[PDB]
Symmetry: C2
Subunit: 172 residues, 2 copies
């Protein structure tokens, strides 16, 4: 199974990743490539394509993340709808898209707790509004957990159970 993790900062994405790795015994890879997302759309698509072949691993931020942070940074490539559906097709059978989020208020609170200085104050709202926009236009099925209601542990357990239950799952 190719577990994909998406969502904004301060949602324990890295923690949940660690737990899933230790448990499911899957390596961890960071999809998002600020460097490559600048160079060009081609080398960017190639990149995500290489990852689309891997399996039995966890990807911390994939195409969906790029389809979000691209609408924020200058000189930042984005995948075309055709390129997306292409990648989703190659992973449709081995993919578990995970979206970890939290309320805007909660995220700013965690951000303040961490000590940010550039902390906009509303840009988060947009990021969140943007994420659920991208997830809504996904070709694959998506799973989301509110990191404000469930702990990093309870979440990893849910996913762990699904993954091990895939043997009975037929993607059609």
């Amino acid at each position: 199974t190719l577990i994909i993790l998406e969502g904004p900062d301060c949602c324990f994405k890295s923690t949940v990743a660690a737990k899933l790795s230790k448990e499911l015994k899957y390596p961890i890879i960071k999809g998002s490539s600020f460097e490559l997302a600048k160079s060009g759309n081609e080398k960017l698509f190639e990149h995500f394509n290489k990852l689309a072949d891997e399996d039995n691993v966890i990807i911390d931020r994939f195409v969906y993340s790029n389809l979000v942070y691209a609408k924020k940074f200058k000189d930042y490539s984005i995948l075309t709808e055709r390129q997306l559906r292409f990648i989703e097709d190659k992973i449709k059978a081995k993919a578990k898209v995970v979206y970890l989020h939290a309320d805007p208020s909660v995220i700013k609170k965690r951000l303040r707790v961490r000590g940010d200085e550039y902390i906009e104050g509303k840009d988060i709202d947009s990021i969140l509004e943007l994420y659920r926009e991208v997830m809504s236009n996904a070709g694959l099925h998506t799973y989301s957990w509110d990191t404000g209601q469930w702990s990093s542990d309870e979440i990893a357990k849910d996913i762990i159970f699904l993954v091990e239950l895939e043997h009975h799952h037929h993607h059609h």
Copy 2:
């Protein structure tokens, strides 16, 4: 005296500001305006112009900061060279431009210590390379402190001494 603080995160800018305020009895104002830096160049210029009138205060990030973060975020206005020199002219006599920075390696280390997930890994290099680029093209005189060599306390003392010494300072 108008104290203007510029530089990247993780350089104790907010801490140096707190001390300067407690001592010099100057209120603190955050220059940068994400909201207004998006709206438009006009309302943005009107913003800094309004701040260029205040005195005996500390501004956490001002025009120089905008002249940096603008080359990074989409839909982000920037001040024109004429608009900058205009503002620098209005403050040339009452301004102390402070630049707090640190080595790229040190900043990433502090970033890691804080727990960032979007932490590029080289974008900082650009930000720093960009800042010293802007500071170099400044109309006012600038003062910079390496937050990697001097403590937040020693820095605030240096500035505090300068400010109180302005009575003897003639800007020409």
